[PDB]
Design a binder for this molecule. Structure first.
Ligand SMILES: Nc1ncnc(N2CCC[C@H](CCC(=O)O)C2)c1Cl
Length: 167
């Protein structure tokens, strides 16, 4: 038993809810919240901008030190940093950004990072401003992640479409 509430169960291990991941994180304090990161950990907009804003920019400060030491992430890759006031840890995962021309097949590699964590609160990778089809992203999530994932979908309309079209 864990503390996530109000989720619809899609599979043995995947759950979904219409929610703002920022508010969901501050209430639950999950062990891991996933950020929809880019390779530079520049948290300007989308999920990343919202999570970073909720940390009062501490996520960005930590991220800039990470990049200065380690260089950029790979598309499809990840790093574990602090969750600040939102979670114990933040798993920064880089899904392909269709609006940059990145290969969509890298979406499966991105979701594989979730398997290193027993339970996660996460957004749909490559959705929103990353330009992928959220229904495809949900399919890849279900077919790739084997650990317990709680997906937060900010937009109520998209949420309804994701549930109603789920196979
Ligand atoms: N076909 C699409 N491709 C990509 N993103 C899409 N949506 C647009 C509305 C907001 C939504 C925000 C992300 C979320 O809901 O967590 C993203 C669509 Cl509809």
């Amino acid at each position: 038993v864990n503390s996530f509430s109000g989720y619809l169960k899609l599979t043995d291990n995947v759950y979904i809810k219409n929610a703002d991941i920022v508010e969901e994180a501050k209430k639950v304090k999950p062990t891991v919240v996933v950020n929809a990161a880019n390779v530079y950990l520049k948290h300007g907009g989308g999920v990343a901008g919202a999570l970073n804003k909720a940390t009062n920019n501490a996520m960005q400060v930590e991220s800039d030190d990470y990049i200065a030491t380690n260089g950029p992430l790979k598309v499809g890759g990840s790093c574990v940093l602090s969750g600040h006031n939102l979670a114990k840890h933040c798993l920064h995962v880089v899904g392909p950004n269709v609006n940059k021309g990145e290969d969509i097949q890298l979406l499966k590699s991105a979701y594989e990072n979730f398997n290193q964590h027993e339970v996660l609160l996460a957004p749909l990778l490559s959705a929103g401003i990353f330009g992928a089809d959220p229904i495809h992203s949900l399919r890849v999530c279900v077919d790739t992640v084997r650990t317990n994932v709680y997906l937060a979908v900010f937009d109520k309309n998209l949420y309804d479409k994701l549930v109603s079209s789920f196979l």
